[PDB]
């Protein structure tokens, strides 16, 4: 028992991190097979950053201008291409530490682990959610660009995020591994509106189930609700409307605990309307939304 | 910017995890050089667990009774010995993935990362603090015994914890890597008093500094306090008394932000006396104590 904000073991991803330098800029790259992936803004300088013309900036670069170093060793670049907001540097050596991997585009509300890196070296790992507004609330300083987000299913790493930018509000934006930004963001130093965010309702319910499984049950009440009634409350409190698909995903947790999903919704309604009254749930004094129902099941069953 | 509960990259520790089986019991072991370390209770059965006579139980075991498997490969055990609550199984092969490492006994209030494992396979990584009462609030199910806690300083892994037991209260207990329990705990299935715990004051102050560095400053006030006055408040609220040694450790954060440590203490006093008023600090609705001043500096500077 006990419930923690757990990240995936980062070892398989640590073996893929490299440092990429182009001119004056250094950031992180992801070396999988014979390709190194990194944010395309590695080719910019300070003057370029307001509205870079990436196609033109890249035309001034040759394979030998991209310095790729995997700690002790220098990689030989034999090709370069830009795909959306990422550069793909073909190298002459396949990464001997390439794990089984996939590139996936995650949905908002899904979670993943980030391995924060500086100069191609890993500094730490943390779990986070892709906000409904397509931002992430990470921990990234200048130089962390190119750090990646991922999930692991047995021996397969699904890479879902590459870090590109910090918005002026201090929230983070990035792309899938094909270089497509999550959200409306563009890789330029401009103020950019992140949409209105919402709380991930299905994740809060999943975390309430993890709380009951682990002994925190003070919030369970004698009430029930309907999806319609609950969604009026979700509306008032900027929570995502709950759907039958969300109820269906919560099925295993509802079955294991014997607490009907709409009964848990009535606990959540009361917590939204009355607050925690100075109490905590799983060490938190707020309603946590960074655990998906899959995360709760995985953690509560000890999946490796 | 942004501040997260970050764990160390777990790769160097993943390469050391093995599965140890003795009879009917399977748990995790730590393979460093030619020795595998695991909790001594791997030699117990269900009948033994109320008050095992470990010396007698171990005498019924031979090297060939300890089955050690590092995924695809079986290790040959050529020696066994019990040191405090750990067993040390000498194997004929040095772990080729042995990182530079140290065994350290951490102080209460210090933090570390745990790589939770089942059957020698890593499931996840999380950061936690050793409570002032020598327990940890982890996430461990049956089979996670032998999972370890550690810190990393550049290329050196300092192992500080091995998981042994879940107390009847759902909190966790374990040993240093010489098998000495942190706290009063004994490896037997009995109800055991964990002392009165307290909040790690120096860590809360460090986290208030991380909050100011990252833009959350609403809690700063026009007041100051003294160590004496602050400690009367710390007393009332079950916080550790602050000492000049704690003020000294906060020096770098005080210098970087320009907020005198006693001025931050006066912010903390007001938060203790008035609560958060429904507001948050770094995404938390409570005063966080799982970040040491060293953690804050490391995270806010991007150390690898
Ligand atoms: C500073 C920082 C901190 C954390 N994460 C990222 C960054 N870097 C930036 O967001 C650049 C300013 C941006 C990058 C995209 C192109 C325009 C320039
Ligand atoms: C169940 C569980 C969950 C999480 N962590 C550990 C455990 N296992 C135990 O604490 C045993 C009961 C204990 C181990 C010490 C010797 C007496 C028996």
Residue A95 sits in a domain whose CATH number is 2.40.10.10
Q: Closest approach of chain A CAs to the CA of B33, in angstroms?
A: 19
**Which helix (H) or strand (E) element contains residue A233?**
helix A227-236
CB B189 less than 6 A from any atom of ligand 2: yes
Ligand lying closest to the C-alpha of residue B185: 2
Domain end point (choices A173, A197, A221): A197
Axis-axis angle for helices B227-236, B261-274 (nearest 10): 30
CB A189 less than 6 A from any atom of ligand 1: yes
Comparing alpha-carbon positions, the chain A residue that sits nearest to B172 is A2
Q: Which of A119, A141, A299 sits opposite B139 (nearest CB)?
A: A299
Q: Closest approach of chain B CAs to the CA of A298, in angstroms?
A: 9
**CB distance A10–B125 less than 8 Å?**
yes
> Residues B6, B39: one domain?
no
The pair of structure tokens assigned to B248 is 């000294």
How far is Cα B44 from Cα B48, in angstroms, rounded to an integer?
Answer: 6
> Residues B245, B274: one domain?
yes
Question: Solved by what technique?
Answer: X-ray
How far is Cα B125 from Cα B107, in angstroms, rounded to an integer?
Answer: 21
How far is Cα B264 from Cα B199, in angstroms, rounded to an integer?
Answer: 16
**CB distance B5–A126 less than 8 Å?**
yes
Q: What are phi and psi of A226, to 5 degrees?
A: -120, 165
The pair of structure tokens assigned to B197 is 């715990």
> Residues B170, B105: one domain?
yes
**SS3 for A173?**
strand
CB half-sphere exposure, B152, CA atoms < 13 A:
24
Going by the DSSP 8-state scheme, the letter that residue A79 receives in this structure is E
CB A123 within 8 A of CB A117: yes
CB A28 less than 6 A from any atom of ligand 1: no
> Residues B207, B236: one domain?
yes
**CB distance A2–B283 less than 8 Å?**
no
How far is Cα A37 from Cα A19, in angstroms, rounded to an integer?
Answer: 11
Ligand lying closest to the C-alpha of residue A40: 1
As a whole number of Å, the CA-based R_g of chain B is 21
Q: Which of B2, B115, B302 sits opposite A9 (nearest CB)?
A: B115
Q: Mention every residue, 6+ apart, whose C-beta is less than 8 A from residue B33.
A: B94, B95, B98
> Residues A183, A206: one domain?
no
Cα–Cα–Cα angle for A206, A211, A213, rounded to 5 degrees: 95
CB half-sphere exposure, B38, CA atoms < 13 A:
33
> Residues B167, B233: one domain?
no
For residue A23, CA distances in Å to A35, A41, A42, A60 come to 20, 11, 8, 11
Q: Closest approach of chain B CAs to the CA of A215, in angstroms?
A: 9
- A41 is annotated as an active-site residue: yes
How far is Cα A99 from Cα A96, in angstroms, rounded to an integer?
Answer: 9
CB A165 less than 6 A from any atom of ligand 1: yes
How far is Cα A46 from Cα A61, in angstroms, rounded to an integer?
Answer: 17
**SS3 for A250?**
coil
For residue B79, CA distances in Å to B45, B65, B91, B141 come to 22, 11, 7, 29
**How many residues are there in chain A?**
304
CB B29 within 8 A of CB B120: yes
Which of B83, B43, B49 has the alpha carbon at shortest distance from B67? Answer: B43
**CB distance B1–A140 less than 8 Å?**
yes
- B22 is annotated as an active-site residue: no
**Which helix (H) or strand (E) element contains residue A12?**
helix A11-14
Q: What resolution in Å is listed for this PDB structure? A: 1.5
Choosing from A41, A80, A163, A164, which is the catalytic residue?
Answer: A41
**CB distance B302–A275 less than 8 Å?**
no
Choosing from B44, B85, B117, B145, which is the catalytic residue?
Answer: B145
Domain end point (choices B99, B127, B161): B99
For residue A240, CA distances in Å to A243, A246, A251, B251 come to 9, 10, 18, 44
Q: Which of A3, A8, A118 sits opposite B302 (nearest CB)?
A: A118
Q: Mention every residue, 6+ apart, whose C-beta is less than 8 A from residue A242.
A: A201, A202, A205, A227, A230, A231, A234, A265
**Three-state helix/strand/coil letters over chain B:** CCCCCCECCCHHHHCCEEEEEECCEEEEEEEECCEEEEEHHHHCCCCHHHCCCHHHHHHCCCHHHEEEEECCEEECEEEEEEECCEEEEEECCCCCCCCEEEECCCCCCCEEEEEEEECCEEEEEEEEECCCCCCECCCCCCCCCCCEEEEEECCEEEEEEEEEEECCCCCEEEECCCCCECCCCCCCCCCCCCCCCCECHHHHHHHHHHHHHCCCCCCCCCCCCCHHHHHHHHHHCCECCCCHHHHHHCHHHHHHHCCCHHHHHHHHHHHHHHCCCCCCECCECCCCCCCCHHHHHHHHHCCC
> Residues B107, B202: one domain?
no
A·B CB contacts under 8 A:
155
Q: Strand order of the sheet with strand B25-32?
A: B73-75, B66-70, B17-22, B25-32, B35-39, B86-91, B77-83
CB A235 less than 6 A from any atom of ligand 1: no
How far is Cα A168 from Cα A188, in angstroms, rounded to an integer?
Answer: 12
Strand pairing of B73-75 and B66-70? antiparallel
> Residues A202, A183: one domain?
no
Ligand lying closest to the C-alpha of residue B146: 2
CB B165 less than 6 A from any atom of ligand 2: yes
> Residues A88, A135: one domain?
no
> Residues A135, A8: one domain?
yes
The pair of structure tokens assigned to B100 is 């530079």
Going by the DSSP 8-state scheme, the letter that residue A249 receives in this structure is H
Token pair 């997260």 in the structure block, residue: B4
The pair of structure tokens assigned to A99 is 């794990």
User: How would you classify residue A52: left for phi > 0, otherwise alpha for psi between -120 and 50, otherwise beta?
Assistant: beta
Number of domains in chain A: 3
- Backbone discontinuities in chain A, residue before each (C to N > 2.5 A): none
> Residues B245, B164: one domain?
no
Q: Closest approach of chain B CAs to the CA of A286, in angstroms?
A: 6
CB B220 within 8 A of CB B212: yes
For B237, the domain range is: 198-301
**SS3 for A106?**
coil
Choosing from A44, A145, A160, A265, which is the catalytic residue?
Answer: A145
Q: Mention every residue, 6+ apart, whose C-beta is less than 8 A from residue A18.
A: A28, A29, A30, A31, A36, A68, A69, A70, A75, A120
> Residues B3, B150: one domain?
yes
How far is Cα B23 from Cα B45, in angstroms, rounded to an integer?
Answer: 8
- For residue A172, the chain B residues in CB contact (below 8 A) are 2
Domain end point (choices B99, B129, B154): B99
């Amino acid at each position: 028992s006990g419930f923690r904000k757990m990240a995936f073991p980062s070892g398989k991803v640590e073996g893929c991190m490299v440092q990429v330098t182009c001119g004056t800029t250094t950031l992180n790259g992801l070396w999988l097979d014979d390709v190194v992936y990194c944010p395309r803004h590695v080719i910019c300088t300070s003057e370029d950053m307001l509205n870079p013309n990436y196609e033109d900036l890249l035309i001034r670069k040759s394979n030998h201008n991209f310095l790729v170093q995997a700690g002790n060793v220098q990689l030989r670049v034999i090709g370069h291409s830009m795909q959306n907001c990422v550069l793909k540097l073909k190298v002459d050596t396949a990464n001997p530490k390439t794990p089984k991997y996939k590139f996936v585009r995650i949905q908002p509300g899904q979670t993943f682990s980030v391995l924060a890196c500086y100069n191609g070296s890993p500094s730490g790992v943390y779990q986070c959610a892709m906000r409904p507004n397509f931002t992430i609330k990470g921990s990234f300083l200048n130089g962390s660009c190119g750090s990646v987000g991922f999930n692991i299913d047995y021996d397969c790493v699904s890479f879902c995020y590459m870090h590109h930018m910090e918005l002026p509000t201090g929230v983070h934006a990035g792309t899938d591994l094909e270089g497509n930004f999550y959200g409306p963001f563009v890789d330029r130093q401009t103020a950019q509106a992140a949409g209105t965010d919402t709380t991930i309702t299905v994740n809060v319910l999943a975390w309430l189930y993890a709380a009951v499984i682990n002994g925190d049950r003070w919030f369970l009440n004698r009430f029930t609700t309907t999806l319609n009634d609950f969604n009026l409350v979700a509306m008032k409190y900027n929570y995502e409307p709950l759907t039958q698909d969300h109820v269906d995903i919560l099925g295993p947790l509802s079955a294991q605990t014997g607490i009907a999903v709409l009964d848990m919704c009535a606990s959540l309604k009361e917590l939204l309307q009355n607050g925690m009254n100075g109490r905590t749930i799983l060490g938190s004094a707020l309603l946590e939304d960074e655990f998906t129902p899959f995360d709760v099941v995985r953690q509560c069953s000890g999946v490796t």
